[PDB]
């Protein structure tokens, strides 16, 4: 009785949202950005490869100096690269070799991995004694670790498969605020740049907008239709893209709280691993289980050029903060790093 | 190149001279993983053989190091792994059809589409004790059961009852069935018929780890 | 983090002496070492450095043939066999770690120093001292016959705190990067073959010799060193 009642009121709400967003749906994105340019086709380089790694690569993350990087593979090896000189600064053992996401603190001073092993481990990378170790095993989630992503060197957000995202708080070790509503697994998650909300795409096709101080999901995003495994802000913070195993990219606009923008191809029949944005956000660079990262005008939705230099599934990319470079991550053990030229 | 970047370069030459190091004493391993449903009794396989539970057995000087997770997302993970113990209790005819299914999934898995898996139908005694009883029937669960034969080649076990026998090679068959219709020989399925003592587990892990690396080097020195 | 240095005493000229240099609360073999002397009533001098794994030895021309410098990864231990001493060898032996990758602090640590008796770009600091009050800012110069800006951006200029009875101790490491564990007041500025250590608000424990040193090519070379005095 009453639960047949409330799941009725739960229908009526969703079609009230739908009904709120289509109001509001007075253009599309494609209409509005038809004047414009094309960007023409984007010709990008492989200017550094980066070897040792000796297994699949499933993480990356850029430093914010844009020059310093850290790539975490299965061989059970937290490697911090020099790309401008190829140099290896550190190599860090991990206790489990299954990791799956790997993060570098803002400051410099940390990183952080984990996997199929529910922890995120904090590594100093100044010490005293010159090598770097362990500060911190953020023990709490009940699934495998997707992502985590730093707000500052004492807090952290991480997203889990266990269907929760979390916010720690490093120096007590303690999860302050638990992210809760997603029912599947939560495969990534972006800080927006003020670092008050982060989006986190899960399994369920779905992703949700989260308010860090408050601890609530705000808005939720649908339109998928398989489990999404990348996602990322908009530079100005107004919006986030995602990439899903259904072969296309979705540009959703948190103000307007619907999907703006479909970037998928006929060729395309792949899943979509990684997703990122140029500095000016103009270009949407995935990653794809067909050997290929693709360059997508994000205004446009026209695909603005391919980087083909990978014999495996592409797994992680990124894009420096100066926005110079891009670094592609690779199950064949390699990373590329990719700008063009005049 | 200044003075402190040849000092920094040939810091980076003594990481990647570590890096090759580690990377073949992980060579020196061969990596398994072990799936199966709750009632699979998977664990008792490998306690008699010795969010990650893992276990080192040597045979022949031989080491296995096999992960037991305790699923289409971190199944990728394992997407280099020698072979994958997929197994399953064929006592429990209720639960065979989501051994099956469970099966099915694995073996079409886009990501385990050249690991072979060594299938290890658990818990034979039961069966044959089931089958002796005949209090419950195969082909209220399989109809297909009630029009299938023993084959002529077939060579069952000393003392075994034809009744088993044919029951058997059924259960087999089906896991068979979906290992054969797709794969085309990059991956193969070696299925097994273990029971809770038996003590030869690991060393059919080892006969079929032989199996599955030289069908690997095949490819190798064939498709060139 | 510790550096102890033995061997040292008073020895007959063409003898030979063996140094050591025990290595404690770090990871020994992740760091380069060097030995830097310093005469009495004189500036620092370089001696030897040995790269982590030992795979790269350097020496002075004024010790080249004359010294072997050897360390002992498991036990920690920094060695310098010398042979042939002549009367210009007598000086405090400093041991010195110092690590090599991006953003690294090289020569952050210096030992004790043991005592020997026996029986190339110039760095130049014209000033030798400098009279200074307490709470007042003080500029101290130095100067480098070659152009220690490299074309990566780095310009590989240091400089050095010892005061009165301790070892030198980094304040500046490339010419703007503030050591680790020193005060903020501290500011390096430099451009080319000119560089200047600002010291806003003079503390009674900055007194002391500042040395600037230069670690563009081998041979490492140091400055003559100003003393500021109350």
């Known amino acids: 009785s009453e639960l047949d009642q409330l799941r009725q009121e739960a229908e009526q709400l969703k079609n009230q949202i739908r009904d709120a967003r289509k109001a509001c749906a007075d253009a599309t994105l494609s209409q509005i950005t038809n004047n414009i340019d094309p960007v023409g086709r984007i010709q990008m380089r492989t200017r550094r490869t980066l070897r040792g790694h000796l297994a699949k690569i499933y993480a990356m993350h850029w430093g914010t100096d844009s020059r310093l990087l850290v790539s975490a593979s299965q061989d059970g090896k937290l490697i911090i690269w020099d790309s401008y000189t190829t140099n290896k600064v550190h190599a860090i053992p991990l206790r489990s070799s299954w990791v799956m996401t790997c993060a570098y603190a803002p400051s410099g001073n940390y990183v952080a991995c984990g996997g199929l092993d529910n922890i995120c481990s904090i590594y100093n990378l100044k010490t005293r004694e010159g090598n770097v170790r362990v500060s911190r095993e953020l023990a709490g989630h009940t699934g495998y670790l997707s992502c985590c992503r730093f707000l500052d060197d004492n807090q952290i957000v991480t997203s889990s498969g266990d269907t929760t995202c979390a916010l720690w708080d490093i120096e007590t070790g303690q999860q302050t605020t638990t992210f809760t509503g997603h029912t599947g697994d939560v495969m990534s998650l972006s800080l927006a740049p003020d670092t008050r909300l982060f989006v986190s795409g899960a399994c369920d096709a779905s992703a949700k907008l989260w308010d860090v101080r408050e601890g609530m999901c705000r808005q939720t995003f649908t339109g998928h239709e398989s489990d999404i495994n990348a996602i990322c802000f908009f530079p100005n913070g107004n919006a986030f893209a995602t990439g899903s195993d259904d072969a296309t990219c979705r540009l959703f606009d948190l103000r307007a709280d619907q999907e703006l923008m479909t970037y998928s191809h006929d060729n395309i029949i792949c899943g979509i691993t990684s997703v990122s944005f140029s500095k000016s956000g103009r270009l949407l660079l995935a990653g794809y289980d067909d050997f290929n990262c693709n360059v997508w005008d994000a205004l446009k939705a026209d695909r603005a050029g391919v980087l083909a230099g990978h014999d495996n599934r592409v797994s992680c990319l990124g894009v420096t903060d100066d926005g110079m470079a891009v670094a592609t991550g690779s199950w064949d053990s390699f990373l590329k790093i990719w700008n063009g030229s005049s | 190149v200044s003075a402190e970047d040849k000092a920094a370069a040939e810091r980076s030459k003594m990481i990647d001279k570590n890096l090759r190091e580690d990377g073949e004493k992980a060579r020196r391993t061969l990596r398994l993983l072990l799936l199966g449903a709750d009632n699979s009794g998977k664990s008792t396989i490998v306690k008699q053989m010795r969010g990650i539970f893992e276990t080192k057995f040597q045979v022949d000087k031989v080491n296995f190091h096999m992960f037991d997770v305790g699923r289409r997302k971190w199944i990728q993970c394992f997407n280099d792994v020698t072979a994958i113990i997929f197994v399953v209790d064929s006592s429990d005819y209720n639960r065979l059809q989501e051994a099956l299914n469970d099966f099915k999934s694995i073996w079409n898995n886009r990501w385990l589409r050249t690991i072979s898996v060594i299938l290890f139908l658990n818990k034979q005694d039961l069966l044959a004790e089931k089958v002796l009883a005949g209090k419950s029937k195969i082909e209220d669960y399989f109809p297909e059961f009630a029009r299938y034969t023993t084959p002529e080649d077939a060579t069952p076990e000393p003392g075994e009852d034809p009744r088993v026998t044919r029951a058997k090679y059924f259960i087999r068959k089906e896991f068979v069935d979906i290992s054969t219709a797709s794969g085309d020989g990059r991956h193969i399925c070696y299925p097994h018929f273990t029971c809770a003592v038996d003590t030869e587990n690991a060393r059919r892990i080892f006969n079929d780890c032989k199996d599955i690396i030289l069908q690997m080097n095949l490819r190798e020195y064939n498709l060139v | 983090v510790q550096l102890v240095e033995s061997g040292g005493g008073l020895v007959q000229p063409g003898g030979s002496r063996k140094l050591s240099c025990s290595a404690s609360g770090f990871a020994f073999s992740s760091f380069g070492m060097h030995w830097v002397r310093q005469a009495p009533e004189k500036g620092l001098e370089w001696v030897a450095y040995?790269?982590?794994?030992?795979?790269?030895?350097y020496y002075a021309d004024t010790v080249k043939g004359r010294f072997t410098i050897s360390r002992d990864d498991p036990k920690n231990t920094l060695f310098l066999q010398m042979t042939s001493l002549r009367s210009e060898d007598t000086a405090m032996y400093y041991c010195?770690?110092?690590?090599?990758?991006?953003?690294?602090?090289?020569?952050?640590?210096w030992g004790q120093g043991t005592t020997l008796t026996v029986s190339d770009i110039v760095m130049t600091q014209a000033t030798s001292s400098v009279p200074v009050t307490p709470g007042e800012s003080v500029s101290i110069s130095c100067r480098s016959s070659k152009s220690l800006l490299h074309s990566n951006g780095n310009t590989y200029l240091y400089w050095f705190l010892q005061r009165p009875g301790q070892s030198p101790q980094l304040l500046i490491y490339?010419?703007?990067n503030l050591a680790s564990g020193v005060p903020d007041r501290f500011s390096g500025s430099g451009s080319g073959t000119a560089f200047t250590l600002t010291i806003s608000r003079l503390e009674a424990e900055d007194v002391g010799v500042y040395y600037c040193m230069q670690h563009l090519e081998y041979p490492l070379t140091f400055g003559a060193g100003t003393k500021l005095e109350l």
């Open positions: 490339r010419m703007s």
């Open positions: 010195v770690r110092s690590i090599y990758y991006y953003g690294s602090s090289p020569f952050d640590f």
């Open positions: 040995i790269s982590s794994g030992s795979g790269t030895i």
